[PDB]
Ligand binder design. Structure first.
Ligand SMILES: *C1=CC(=O)N(COCN2C(=O)C=C(*)C2=O)C1=O
Ligand SMILES: [Cu+2]
Ligand SMILES: [Cu+2]
Ligand code: NI
Ligand code: NI
Lengths: 128, 128
């Protein structure tokens, strides 16, 4: 099975998918993030961040408070399983993580931590 | 009947109401907008803008392109019936407009034009 997914974050503050399925036969999984919009990072920046459903709110809250210079993520946040950098218009970034970090049955969420975006930019990730 | 309404825009990118009813006996109507959040205008700014439902998308699109220095509103936009200034954390602004500018039966929408906010920060305004 394939072990990567291409995701886009646009100016309408949205991801082009709300669900990701990671096949258990994958050893590593790659997420390619691109920003096909025209707005800069400081105004419409997006990142793809993965945590358990329970940790999401905490990550989003501390991230918001951390500021743009920290890509809106609290430094040394052990709750973040994987994440891309915060990108703006015309940029792209990829993150590859070990699937062994995921456990079956557990609920995972991916989201953007730029202030307010997680309201719409979020989705589930499942290991099947 | 009362002819004013207090509205708040917060850091969670949301208005504390999604519907406004203007009593036809009102000659003027006032909207008091406040921002009880902690984020600055450049990152989480909010304004209250009124237009017909049909004009909303156009106002939001041209506003986004106009930039922060223009309060995210195209200059001389005749589609905007009324609007407050774009405000940030701890700020407040009020707008009073003549109810005669509204017609019964017509569909009106109020929204924030800061990039991406209209996705969640919008509501209906009706003259009853
Ligand atoms: C994109 C990055 C950046 O710093 N910037 C300018 O931001 C100016 N302001 C402001 O006026 C209030 C907060 C803030 O960052 C960009 O446009
Ligand atoms: Cu985002
Ligand atoms: Cu807003
Ligand atoms: Ni395979
Ligand atoms: Ni009255």
């Amino acid at each position: 099975a394939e072990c990567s997914v291409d995701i886009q974050g646009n100016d309408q503050m949205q991801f082009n998918t709300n669900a990701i399925t990671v096949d258990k036969s994958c050893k590593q999984f790659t997420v390619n993030l691109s920003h096909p919009g025209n707005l800069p990072k400081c105004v419409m920046g997006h990142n793809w961040v993965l945590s358990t459903a329970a940790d999401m709110q905490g990550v989003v809250t501390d991230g918001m408070a951390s500021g743009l210079d920290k890509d809106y993520l609290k430094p040394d946040d052990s709750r973040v399983i994987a994440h891309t950098k915060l990108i703006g218009s015309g940029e792209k970034d990829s993150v590859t993580f070990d699937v062994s970090k995921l456990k079956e049955g557990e609920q995972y969420m991916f989201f953007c931590t730029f202030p307010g975006h997680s309201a719409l930019m979020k989705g589930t990730l499942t290991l099947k």
